Design a binder for these strands. Structure first.
Ligand SMILES: NC(=O)c1cccnc1
Length: 208
DNA sequence: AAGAC
């Protein structure tokens, strides 16, 4: 059976993504990504989105494969003013860290009741690219690196050190420059015109 | 363009 690494190679996956409010970025670039449970245990300040955590795994960090969860992301941009950023993360996390793989949002009733052990591993990862995910039929032109359902999720049950963050995307140049000054060894990227296909876009538009 | 229960 194919390994996680083999699937990455075959599908041309190059990026994992994690959106977050800019309020969190200093702390993430300093300390790495941490779960809600761990931030609470360390008494670290953070700005979270979800007030329910219906997934049931507050000790896990949520990532996306190849494109952010543009639906949940846009919701929280409407609800929380200020700049949002998108962390780009090495696909190596998928094998190097303790990951569970979900073909849709990890809070969905379609996936959250399954034995967590069945969601680890290459078989669970391959399911993110299935021809039909709980009624979403994969488009025949969707490129190989994209999940069938834009909300497909990775839950990472340990910390992600900042060396796995390969770049960070900003919604304006000033935001990127601010963080570049503070973190000169890191890559801080930005869009000048947000009227464009950007990682802030819905995926169907981005790939259109 | 607005998850999840
Ligand atoms: N922060 C994230 O990128 C995220 C959160 C919830 C679901 N999928 C991704």
């Amino acid at each position: 059976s194919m390994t996680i690494q083999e699937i990455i190679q075959q599908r041309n996956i190059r990026s994992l993504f994690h959106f977050t409010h800019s309020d969190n970025l200093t702390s993430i670039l300093d300390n790495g990504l941490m779960s809600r449970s761990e931030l609470d245990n360390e008494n670290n300040e953070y700005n979270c989105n979800d007030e329910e955590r219906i997934d049931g795994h507050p000790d896990a960090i949520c990532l996306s494969v190849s494109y952010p969860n543009a639906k949940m992301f846009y919701k929280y941009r409407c609800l929380k003013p200020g700049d949002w950023v998108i962390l780009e993360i090495n696909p190596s996390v998928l094998w190097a860290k303790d990951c569970a793989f979900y073909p849709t949002n990890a809070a969905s009733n379609n996936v959250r009741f399954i034995n967590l052990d069945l969601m680890k591993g290459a078989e669970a990862f391959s399911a993110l690219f299935s021809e039909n995910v709980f009624g979403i039929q994969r488009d025949v032109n969707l490129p190989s690196e994209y999940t069938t359902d834009v909300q497909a999720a990775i839950l990472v049950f340990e910390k992600i050190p900042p060396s796995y963050i390969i770049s960070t995307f900003h919604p304006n140049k000033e935001s990127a420059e601010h963080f570049k000054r503070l973190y000169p060894q890191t890559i801080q990227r930005y869009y000048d015109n947000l009227n464009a296909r950007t990682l802030y876009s819905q995926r169907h538009y981005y790939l259109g």
